[PDB]
UniProtKB/Swiss-Prot annotation:
<comment type="similarity">
    <text>Belongs to the DNA repair metallo-beta-lactamase (DRMBL) family.</text>
</comment>
<protein>
    <recommendedName>
        <fullName>DNA cross-link repair 1A protein</fullName>
    </recommendedName>
</protein>
<comment type="function">
    <text>May be required for DNA interstrand cross-link repair. Also required for checkpoint mediated cell cycle arrest in early prophase in response to mitotic spindle poisons. Possesses beta-lactamase activity, catalyzing the hydrolysis of penicillin G and nitrocefin. Exhibits no activity towards other beta-lactam antibiotic classes including cephalosporins (cefotaxime) and carbapenems (imipenem).</text>
</comment>
<comment type="subunit">
    <text>Binds constitutively to TP53BP1. Binds CDC27, which is itself a component of the anaphase promoting complex (APC). Binds PIAS1.</text>
</comment>
Length: 341
């Protein structure tokens, strides 16, 4: 059944709740972003109102074939009324089109649902600064102190420098980047930019990217693999067998692959700096796992919450085990006692 952490009290609303059938008493289904664990259930047969960003609505129409009459896109940073209730969509610093949602309940309660987010100090100057938030529905993906990772900027500088060095030393090397969802487009676009190439990809993935309102996108991507020396493949193909196979397909245009797997966290983070990352190599194939995250680190999450000072926190991730739930509740209490709220 629909879990309580997907329901907004005092409303008929749910958030990211499309796989439970008809949720009894739901008048408006919000979707924070286009990742499959969150949209699971949607299709052309859905006939209730879906509220979302413009970009998420482009993906619902073009990729899932949801009918236009049920897609209700909202502008960001704008007070809107939905079924009698004031709401605002905010940028979540996750993937393209991902939002946080502010609900202003008729009784005076203010609720923030983060969806999935990567907390940032820039959020402290949005419309969130303007009133008190009483309840926070929080993306707790990496809510434990072991989870450190570098800035996105540091990670992209490493990737750009590594790729440019490799291809200038060997003009017959191919660069491959893995993907299995939207998000992390800076990785492949920044490397193609430094090399003077477009990124080549499948027709399915090109269609997906053309829904994202990215500026000058027609100048950066292509379905012509032969004219490109940065290729995108399914994340599943980023291994030695998958890559050897792909190299056969390029007909001796290339004699070396340098591949990137943008993971979330990996336990080489509790020891190793970004400067010190090394690839796994077999023959003429090298694979780099780079810690490019679109979720908050522990310290980023803690700063956001200690700034916001909510009265009550409802985790939305890692909620399935008692040990995880109890650990998270202990951190929430530490933060509140340290900051004095
Ligand atoms: Ni996500």
């Amino acid at each position: 059944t629909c879990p309580f952490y997907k329901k907004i009290p005092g409303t008929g609303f749910t958030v990211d709740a499309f796989q439970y059938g008809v949720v009894e008493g739901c008048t408006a289904y919000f979707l924070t972003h286009f990742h499959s664990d969150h949209y699971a259930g949607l299709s052309k047969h859905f006939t209730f109102p879906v509220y979302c960003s413009e970009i998420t609505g482009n993906l619902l129409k073009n990729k899932l074939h949801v009918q236009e009459q049920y897609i209700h896109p909202l502008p960001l940073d704008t007070e809107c009324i939905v079924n009698g209730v004031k709401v605002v969509l905010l940028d979540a610093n996750h993937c393209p089109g991902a939002v946080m949602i502010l609900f202003y309940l008729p009784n005076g309660t203010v609720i923030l649902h983060t969806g999935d987010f990567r907390a940032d100090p820039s959020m402290e100057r949005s419309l969130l600064a303007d009133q008190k938030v009483h309840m926070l529905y929080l993306d707790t993906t990496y809510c434990s102190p072991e989870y450190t990772f570098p800035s996105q900027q540091e990670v992209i500088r490493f990737a750009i420098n590594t790729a440019f060095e490799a291809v200038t030393l060997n003009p017959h090397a191919l660069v491959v980047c893995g993907t299995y969802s939207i998000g992390k487009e800076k990785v492949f676009l920044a490397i193609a930019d430094v090399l003077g190439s477009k990124v080549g990809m499948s027709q399915e993935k090109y269609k997906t990217l053309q829904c994202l309102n990215i500026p000058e996108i027609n100048s950066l991507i292509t379905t012509d693999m032969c004219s490109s020396l940065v290729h995108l493949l399914p994340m599943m193909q980023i291994n030695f067998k998958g890559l050897q196979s792909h190299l056969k397909k390029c007909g001796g245009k290339y004699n070396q692959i340098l591949a990137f797997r943008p993971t979330g966290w990996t336990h080489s983070n509790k020891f190793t700096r970004i400067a010190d990352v090394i690839p796994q190599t077999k023959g003429n194939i090298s694979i780099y796992g780079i810690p490019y995250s679109e979720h908050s680190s522990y310290l980023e999450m803690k700063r956001f919450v200690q700034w916001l000072k909510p009265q009550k926190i409802i985790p939305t991730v890692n909620v399935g085990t008692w040990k995880s739930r109890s650990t998270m509740e202990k951190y929430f209490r530490e933060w509140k006692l340290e900051a004095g709220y």
